[PDB]
Amino acid sequence: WTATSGSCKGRCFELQEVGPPDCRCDNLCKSYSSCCHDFDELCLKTARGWECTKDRCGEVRNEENACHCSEDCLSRGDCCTNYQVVCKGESHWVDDDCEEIKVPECPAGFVRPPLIIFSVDGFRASYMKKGSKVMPNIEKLRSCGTHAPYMRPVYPTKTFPNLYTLATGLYPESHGIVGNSMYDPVFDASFHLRGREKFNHRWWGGQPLWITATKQGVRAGTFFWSVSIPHERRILTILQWLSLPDNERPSVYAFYSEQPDFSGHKYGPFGPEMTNPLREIDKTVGQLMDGLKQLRLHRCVNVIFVGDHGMEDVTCDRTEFLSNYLTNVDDITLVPGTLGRIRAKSINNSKYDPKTIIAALTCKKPDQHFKPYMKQHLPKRLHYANNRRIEDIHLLVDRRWHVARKPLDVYKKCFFQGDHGFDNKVNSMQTVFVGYGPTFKYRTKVPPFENIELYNVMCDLLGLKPAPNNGTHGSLNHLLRTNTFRPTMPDEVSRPNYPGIMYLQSEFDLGCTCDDKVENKLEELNKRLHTKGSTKERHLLYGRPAVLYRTSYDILYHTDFESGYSEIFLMPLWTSYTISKQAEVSSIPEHLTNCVRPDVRVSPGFSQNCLAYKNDKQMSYGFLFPPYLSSSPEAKYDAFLVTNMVPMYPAFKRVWAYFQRVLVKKYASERNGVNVISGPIFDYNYDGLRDTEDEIKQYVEGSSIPVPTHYYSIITSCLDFTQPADKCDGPLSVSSFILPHRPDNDESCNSSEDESKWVEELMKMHTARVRDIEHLTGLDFYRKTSRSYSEILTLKTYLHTYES
Ligand SMILES: *[C@@H]1O[C@H](CO)[C@@H](O[C@@H]2O[C@H](CO)[C@@H](O[C@@H]3O[C@H](CO[C@H]4O[C@H](CO)[C@@H](O)[C@H](O[C@H]5O[C@H](CO)[C@@H](O)[C@H](O)[C@@H]5O[C@H]5O[C@H](CO)[C@@H](O)[C@H](O)[C@@H]5O)[C@@H]4O)[C@@H](O)[C@H](O[C@H]4O[C@H](CO)[C@@H](O)[C@H](O)[C@@H]4O[C@H]4O[C@H](CO)[C@@H](O)[C@H](O)[C@@H]4O)[C@@H]3O)[C@H](O)[C@H]2NC(C)=O)[C@H](O)[C@H]1NC(C)=O
Ligand SMILES: Cn1c(C(=O)NC2CS(=O)(=O)C2)cnc1COc1cc(Cl)c(C#N)cc1C(C)(C)C
Ligand SMILES: [Ca+2]
Ligand SMILES: [Ca+2]
Ligand SMILES: [Cl-]
Ligand SMILES: [Cl-]
Ligand SMILES: [K+]
Ligand code: NA
Ligand SMILES: [Zn+2]
């Protein structure tokens, strides 16, 4: 109950929320049924529209007008945005030449350049080129400022997840807004876009920019705009706030447009009806820039033009129905559409079985347009699991499709021709970034980056210390003229041991055999040299990874590879090797098929053993440095050391062997050599973070050998592929993956076929950033290169997406 019979006189769009049941005049007032009686009359004026005309110039102020063309309007801060153009012979901002903004050019009393975030819903990356002819203001921002070819959203590629990631620098799993609808079992409550539920603070985790700003003495405008406030009035409201006195004036502002998403849903991304919404957004940008120019702020304010997600072609007829797969279809609740999430109708149902639901959804139809996953099995690059609001069963829906429970759900609740929410690597989901202003670079292209990075930059732009987030601070320094954040490499926590030969063969009782007894003085000194690190400059190109937690580990050198061998996990944390373009692939000789060799540098008590793998009927083993890429028959013996062995499901060994036997050499040939770092990952609680050993849920039967949840590889080469990987003078090129270590290949529908037909496709789905691997391993890579640390941070954030 509000008492809506106070007044908004002189409080229109007040910045501090006065508290119920005083009546409100800020702009959530609408969403709470709490506006003062006179809010519309006083705060939402519309008379005479939004543009000065020649006849209004010098008018007598009339306070009923929506905006003013009277002589006193600039000092009152409420002219129509085109006032100077119409009434003072000025040029529209868009008609002026691009002029570099080397320093902020701010009115007196401005302590720092303001930041305006101009967010556009559903603005697909390719609109920048395809609509260029009708968006002159946006094209000027883009060509004059700093821009990327596109910006990668987070998954799911929906509005609230992406805008709140923008505001927090957090993955949806961490901020809590994991979809446009959710259930929180702990709260026992449901969240929807409609409804008033979404306004409860309990949903919204992390620390959004406006709170970061306010805690550190920087004032913010509103970020949420009521749907009934027209765009022209949101712009005027921002410009009015910008004429407040210095002690009252915000430094950060946001403007939000429901378009072009709104029309894209109706008309598809490139429907003829989409030209007009693009024109209208551009005109709104024009109003802001002309309003800034009137206030002498157009060379003072940093503007960020950013989208939340793109838009794909999606129709009613491209819908998969769970009722075509399950019989029990009425025992589930599906969160439907461009993703699926499944849980039980009743938690009083003890008969509900995830495993049978998954099996009933797996490769059941030959052209099936969705794939089921337990959420812990989703590609780690989605970071979509560590939240109670994300249901254990997930469906990744093919682009251009929907999933629904039953057909009646689609015609008792055709219309739409566009939608979004797919995998965030999908081209049609990519969105836009432009930064324009004194702090951004001039006429600069930057590579595509992820929207989780922007929070740190926005904090830099405003002199704020960012709250802890998923960005990599420094990775976007290259966007900025000044206000760079000069990151420093994290300190190594554990220093390695460098063991020599300390154990006689007979001290080992591992139940291993190798056929390796086959006796020179030239070749005697050589082997010694290799075991002491003589080839290490070839195989370890970017220094040793730093271990950023407390543990016990050994560096082991070999002719063909170097490893960091964990005494706690009984296997390498990392294995590093370089494969030149000219390298030869060989087979595992017949006599060496089951060969495993004790490592006389490492104690029996810190070694794996062969017996465990023999007794474990489900578990086999593989090798991190592949025997197939041995430099010589003699070097090959090194690859069979027990210190190179790792636990692997037979089904996973199909993947791993094909990667090691065929793909590494392919990459070396295409990229002119590669450096490979491979190792295990343990993420049993699916939080994206290295497990401690007391979190491991599975071991090789009857042993203390932990079973990895995933295997990674980082594959680096020279960006200038005329230079070999091992003699690269300039920037690097990387691709990485985090393959799930699964006992079946049920994820791959074509896995009964030869590996040449499915393995590479799996690996692409599980592409990863180096930084993803860093979080999962507590390692820090690229410690010793020629390159600046900011560049390396950019490289560590790169994702190879394999889109056309
Ligand atoms: C992306 O970046 C983010 C942000 O940097 C990273 O997330 C951080 O990870 C940290 C490590 O996991 C984590 O730290 C823990 O937090 C506990 C304090 O928590 C509250 O306070 C903060 C600060 O204001 C707040 O942000 C938190 O927010 C969560 O809480 C609610 C969820 O209901 C939501 O409002 C919000 O969305 C957020 O949810 C998300 O995070 C939680 C976990 O915090 C998830 O469960 C959700 O799914 C969702 O993802 C909190 O309100 C602190 O209590 C923990 O301490 C334990 O462990 C330490 C080890 O040193 C030790 O001292 C103790 O043993 C202690 O153990 C005791 O508690 C145990 C666990 O309950 C118990 O089992 C023991 O036996 C003991 O009693 C811990 O420090 C930090 O909170 C999050 N921050 C955020 C915002 O998510 C994220 O990791 C990054 N992602 C990647 C991939 O890098
Ligand atoms: C998205 N949105 C809506 C909306 O969705 N309205 C419909 C749901 S309805 O049914 O109520 C009508 C209204 N205003 C906004 C803008 O919100 C933002 C803008 C930016 Cl720039 C950032 C950042 N950084 C963050 C946000 C929020 C979402 C975190 C507040
Ligand atoms: Ca949206
Ligand atoms: Ca973990
Ligand atoms: Cl916004
Ligand atoms: Cl959703
Ligand atoms: K076995
Ligand atoms: Na399969
Ligand atoms: Zn939409």
Are 451 and 424 in contact, with CB atoms under 8 Å apart? no
Q: Mapping DSSP to helix (H, G, I), strand (E, B) and coil, where does residue 722 land?
A: coil
Distance CA 628, CA 649 (A): 19
Nearest CA to ligand 2 atom 19: 223
Are 42 and 56 in contact, with CB atoms under 8 Å apart? no
What 8-state DSSP symbol labels residue 453?
Answer: G
Ligand 1, CB within 6 Å, residue ranges: 170-171, 173-176, 205-206, 383, 386-387, 468-470, 688-689, 775
Q: Where are the alpha helices (DSSP H) in 542-621?
A: 610-615
Helix axes 789-797 and 770-777, enclosed angle (nearest 10): 90
- Look up 159 and say whether it is catalytic: yes
Q: Is 121 annotated as a binding residue?
A: yes
Distance CA 662, CA 542 (A): 25
Residue from 146, 157, 159, 797 carrying the catalytic annotation: 159
Ligand 5 centre distance from Cα of residue 544 (Å)? 43
Q: Where are the alpha helices (DSSP H) in 603-703?
A: 610-615, 633-639, 650-658, 664-671
CA dihedral of 568, 571, 574, 576, whole degrees rounded to 10:
140
The CB density around residue 76, as the number of other CB atoms within 10 Å, is 12
Pick from 716, 513, 707, 475: nearest CA to 598? 513
Instruction: State the CATH number of the domain containing residue 768.
Output: 3.40.570.10
Opening angle at CA 309, ends 307 and 310, nearest 5: 105
* 263, burial (CB in 10 Å: exposed 0-12, middle 13-18, buried 19+): buried
Q: What is the largest CA-CA distance in the chain?
A: 105
Half-sphere exposure of 589 (CA within 13 A, CB side): 15
Distance CA 483, CA 475 (A): 13
**What domain range is 703 assigned to?**
505-797
Distance CA 391, CA 181 (A): 12
Pick from 562, 527, 716: nearest CA to 632? 527
Distance CA 762, CA 804 (A): 17
Tokens of 387: 């939240």
Q: Kindly provide the resolution of this structure in angstroms, with one decimal.
A: 1.8
Question: Which residues face 189 on adjacent strands?
Answer: 184
Which atom, in ligand 2's list, is nearest to the CA of 31? 11
Q: How do the residues of the chain divide into helix, strand and coil, expressed in percent and rounded to 5?
A: 30, 20, 50
Nearest CA to ligand 1 atom 46: 387
Nearest CA to ligand 2 atom 17: 224
Sheet-wide strand order for 339-344: 332-335, 339-344, 393-397, 370-374
